[PDB]
Amino acid sequence: SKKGVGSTKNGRDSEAKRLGAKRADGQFVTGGSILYRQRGTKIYPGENVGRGGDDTLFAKIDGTVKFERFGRDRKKVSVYPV
Amino acid sequence: MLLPKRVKYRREHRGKMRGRAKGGTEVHFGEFGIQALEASWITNRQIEAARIAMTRYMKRGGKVWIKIFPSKPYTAKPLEVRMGSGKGAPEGWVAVVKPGKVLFEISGVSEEVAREALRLASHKLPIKTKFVKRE
Amino acid sequence: AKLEITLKRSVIGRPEDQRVTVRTLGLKKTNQTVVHEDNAAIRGMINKVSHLVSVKEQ
RNA sequence: UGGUGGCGAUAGCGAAGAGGUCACACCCGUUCCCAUACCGAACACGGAAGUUAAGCUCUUCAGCGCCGAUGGUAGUCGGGGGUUUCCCCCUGUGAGAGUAGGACGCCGCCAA
RNA sequence: UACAAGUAGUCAGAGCCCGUUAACGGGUGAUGGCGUGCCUUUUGUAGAAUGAACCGGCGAGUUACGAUCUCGUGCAAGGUU
RNA sequence: AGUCUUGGAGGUAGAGCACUGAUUGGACUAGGGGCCCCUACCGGGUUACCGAAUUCAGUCAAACUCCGAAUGCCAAUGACUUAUCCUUGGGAGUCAGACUGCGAGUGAUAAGAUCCGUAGUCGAAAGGGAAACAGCCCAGACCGCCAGCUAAGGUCCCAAAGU
RNA sequence: UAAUAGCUCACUGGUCGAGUGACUCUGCGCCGAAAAUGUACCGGGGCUAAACGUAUCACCGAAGCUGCGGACUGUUCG
RNA sequence: GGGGCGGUCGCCUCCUAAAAGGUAACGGAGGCGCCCAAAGGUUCCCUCAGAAUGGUUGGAAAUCAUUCGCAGAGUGUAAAGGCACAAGGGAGCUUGACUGCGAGACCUACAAGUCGAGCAGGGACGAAAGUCGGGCUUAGUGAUCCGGUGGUUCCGCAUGGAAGGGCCAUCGCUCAACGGAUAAAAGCUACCCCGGGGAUAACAGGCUUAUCUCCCCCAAGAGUCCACAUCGACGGGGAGGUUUGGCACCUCGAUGUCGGCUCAUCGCAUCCUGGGGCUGUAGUCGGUCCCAAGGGUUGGGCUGUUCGCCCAUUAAAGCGGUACG
């Protein structure tokens, strides 16, 4: 014999988006290349690097990325041309 | 029957218990306490029965302490069902006793009656225990 | 200067990184002696392999 | 001494004490630009009666806040055991709330 | 070959019999060690999953027309009916 | 590709209370009981009788984190070793996996259970060990030899080696 | 039975006169321990070492490695 | 986690997630099928929530004033991230919620999705530098075919036109089973059939032991006093695999399923018979516990019934295992 149970009403979750570092420290990069995919301002951009529509960090010039500390707690990302 | 009067989510994982106790290792408030020396779960029925076996024998001796609250719920599926199709309903409250934790602290009571009384309360628990006194 | 490498415990059954490291020292099969020069790279090889292979000096 | 900068507040918050001829700032009064969803404290307006009181600058201090490795541990890579919902041994590696103390500012650039 | 249990083999092996496409030969083998058929399907078969009583015969990827790729040929900015 | 050096991102184990919840006692009282009387309690005096708010001390947390490794990940440069990497084209089979470790779920921290990540073996791997045994341990079969050395395991005998 | 009894424990005196009494940690061991065709939870025989723990050295032990030979496949040239 | 029934089917956020990314379950929590002519864009200027104290209508908070006050408050809306040099609030102006693009870059089987400096034309705001290709970021949404609408320097079957068809812009799907079979769709079969599966259920075997059956530990108490003659709370530990279960491991190219008859056989956790201990055991009788499996362990009424209840005997009318023999 059996007993009937159901109604979990929990089984859904969205398709998870790729977020994170897509270039490493010291990488040569190209003009227009993304460096970090964040969601909200985790890292403020520095020189030669912009901020996208959905807070994306993109390299304006081809160069070498460097990650640095900004202030007490925050990070900064920058591009140095070679 | 130590009820947490409100709880954030009603179903957590059972978790795993590794290593020694985080805090409350030694006697702090009373003079003599009871310490557990291996890991297991502990539930409110046990804690209440232990406090009865302690305090009712102890009568007018002094006062007692508990430094364990069975905050974490544990669930169970209803009896005689096929497993699966959603987590079961919660039905009880449990606490973790990592080895090294002190269970109960006694106060205002001479050493030997507290000794035999903690020994009596030990059999209510499902764990191997050790007497520890204050330094 | 040159320290030799003698594989003792067989590579099979052991996980992938140990397998690949044992391959990179040219240890094709069990119980050969492989002569290599000494520097920090080969030393890194032997302490994170360390039990399938015995090391000794000339 | 004023202006403007870089350095993670080791830069602070506190508690006290000094300064102003110059500079800075409180002050004076809105008349004409301009303003107060109501107003010359605020925006600007154009002066200089007295005022270090505050702002500001220097002097002191570990109360708070901050920084902080040493040896200990917890954890953990890899091996190796065991009575194995979990413990133990070894090569490494190295927790943070803990103190030894550090600190109540460091370097410019232009106008005295 | 009548004190021995055995996917029935294999390999050691004494004894006995015979003598060959002559070669470190042939038959039988007391005794010892090891050893649960074949195929299909399965994560996994000695399987108590399936199929086969045996023997012999028959019995399953070809051709046509196109396409594509490789190879090899004849010509080559031409090739070809 | 491996390794050494070096640069990073990342909040797990740990740890911790700074936030969010939970939670224990000490102190204290706002305020709810407490009866009396004046009586609309106007208030006094009211038991530690309860009891918000602070402080002292203490305990937990997957959806708590002022912190935070080991590893793994992505790179750069040089050094050594190794040689396997990319592009295109032809031709496939595979979409039922299992077990053993470790890290999780669900389960009753039950299952030779199910479902994930990671490592190995079987799958598709015979040989030696564990009596027999796929997944446990050691180890890879091109053949032959009446050769030696050995790994796991073992050395009274069955049954080889130390009564 | 209620003191009323050889009597007995608290406690002290003399007898001979040496070990005597509490706790903690830890190794190993015992009871707890009852199933169904038969010993049946060392593979048997059996074992008080032929068990366990520590240290050392022998030896066995595979189709692993090496030795001898044969065949085949790749790379440098027979 | 056999089907049916229940629930769900797409998208977004967190945890599960093992400090890169990714990662399942009928795992744990919420939201979405919009809204905003400003809740945009620029320029310029500020700054919270809460508390304390005064003040009347007026307070527990309506509106003022002071002080403290890193962020507790907001950030259109779910959560997460981030935000006080604003991304929070206020004011003026305006439509960049523009066209043609786009070096490159992420992600990905494909289809898709996402960012993007900079260039051209023409703007808006500001004096300028400079900003602006909607919202603070992540949801607020669907293929193709077919048809409608607007523009076309496109083609239009002898020619010239038209009918029509292209190209561009655009509208029509809770096509929500949301990568959508058709424009257009419900049930029964114990009259049933075929191809397959132990990939998948019923019986039985197996693993587990929740449940069940026994054995216990501590002991509050009951027991006229006394826990421990007998029973034993609240709690804990086990063993067994006869119940009900969970898992799907052999069997669907067949392993016959309840009960009864005939026949037994085994275990002991013993119903009688044997030997003992304690007793709240005077003796006749008992209660419990231990050793003991040699043997025995009844006929009927009722129901298919095992099981029960009843009648009458007996020393006793045992419990279980052997594919519920």
DSSP letter assigned to residue B53: H
* Burial zone of C53 (CB within 10 Å; 0-12 exposed, 13-18 middle, 19+ buried): buried
Nearest-angstrom CA–CA distance, B34 and B124: 13
Nearest-angstrom CA–CA distance, B23 and B36: 13
Cβ–Cβ < 8 Å for A21, A75: no
Which nucleotide lies closest to C49 by the C1' atom and the CA atom?
Answer: D78
- The residue whose two tokens read 């901020």 is A51
Nearest-angstrom CA–CA distance, A26 and B12: 43
Cα dihedral A30/A35/A41/A42 (nearest 10)? -150
| Cβ under 8 Å to A: B residues 63-92 | 78, 80-82, 85-87
Cα dihedral B5/B8/B14/B16 (nearest 10)? -100
DSSP A36-75: EE-SS-SEEE-TTB---TTS-EEBSSSSEEEEEEETTTEE
Q: Is the CB of B89 under 7 A from strand H?
A: no
Structure token digits, residue B93: 């409250």
Span between the terminal Cα atoms of chain C, in Å: 9
Nearest-angstrom CA–CA distance, B133 and B28: 10
Cβ–Cβ < 8 Å for A76, A45: yes
| CA/C1' separation B112–G6 (Å) | 40
Nearest-angstrom CA–CA distance, A2 and B81: 7
Structure token digits, residue A41: 């301002």
- Tell me the shortest Cα–Cα distance from A21 to chain B, in angstroms: 32
Span between the terminal Cα atoms of chain A, in Å: 75
CB contacts, 8 Å: A3 with chain B: 78, 80-82
Strand partners, B130: B35
**Rounded-to-5 percentages of helix, strand, coil across chain B:** 20, 25, 55
Structure token digits, residue A42: 């985790």
| CA/C1' separation B92–E15 (Å) | 85
Between chains, do A6 and B85 touch, taking CB under 8 Å as contact?
A: yes
Strand partners, A68: A76
- The residue whose two tokens read 């069990």 is C30
- The residue whose two tokens read 């059999």 is B123
Q: Please, which experimental method was used?
A: cryo-EM
- Tell me the shortest Cα–Cα distance from B89 to chain A, in angstroms: 11
| Cβ under 8 Å to B: A residues 1-30 | 2-3, 5-8, 10
Amino acid residing at B108: G
Closest CA to B39 of B21, B24, B54, B59: B21
Which nucleotide lies closest to C10 by the C1' atom and the CA atom?
Answer: F139
> CB-CB: which of B78, B82, B87 is closest to A2?
B82
Q: Is the CB of B17 under 7 A from strand D?
A: yes
Closest CA to A10 of B91, B85, B6: B85
Check residues 34 to 63 of chain B and report those whose beta carbon is under 7 Å from nucleic acid strand D. 39-40
Residue C5: which H helix or E strand, with range? Answer: strand C2-7
H helices of B1-135, where?
Answer: 44-58, 111-122
Helices (H) and strands (E) in chain B, counts: 2, 7
Write the CA distances from B72 to A56, B7, B26, integer angstroms: 41, 9, 23
CA B134 to chain centre: 20
- The residue whose two tokens read 């992938």 is C16
Nearest-angstrom CA–CA distance, B49 and B67: 16
Cβ–Cβ < 8 Å for B88, B78: yes
Between chains, do B80 and A3 touch, taking CB under 8 Å as contact?
A: yes
CB contacts, 8 Å: B81 with chain A: 2-3, 5
Q: Which residue of B has its CA nearest to A2?
A: B81
- The residue whose two tokens read 């067989």 is C10
CB contacts, 8 Å: A5 with chain B: 78, 81, 85-86
- The residue whose two tokens read 């590579």 is C11
- The residue whose two tokens read 């591009």 is A79
Strands in chain B per DSSP E: 32-36, 40-43, 63-66, 72-75, 90-97, 102-107, 129-133
Q: How is the beta sheet containing C2-7 ordered, strand by strand? A: C33-37, C2-7, C53-57
Residues contacting residue C17 through CB under 8 Å, at least 6 positions apart? none
Nearest-angstrom CA–CA distance, B62 and C28: 77
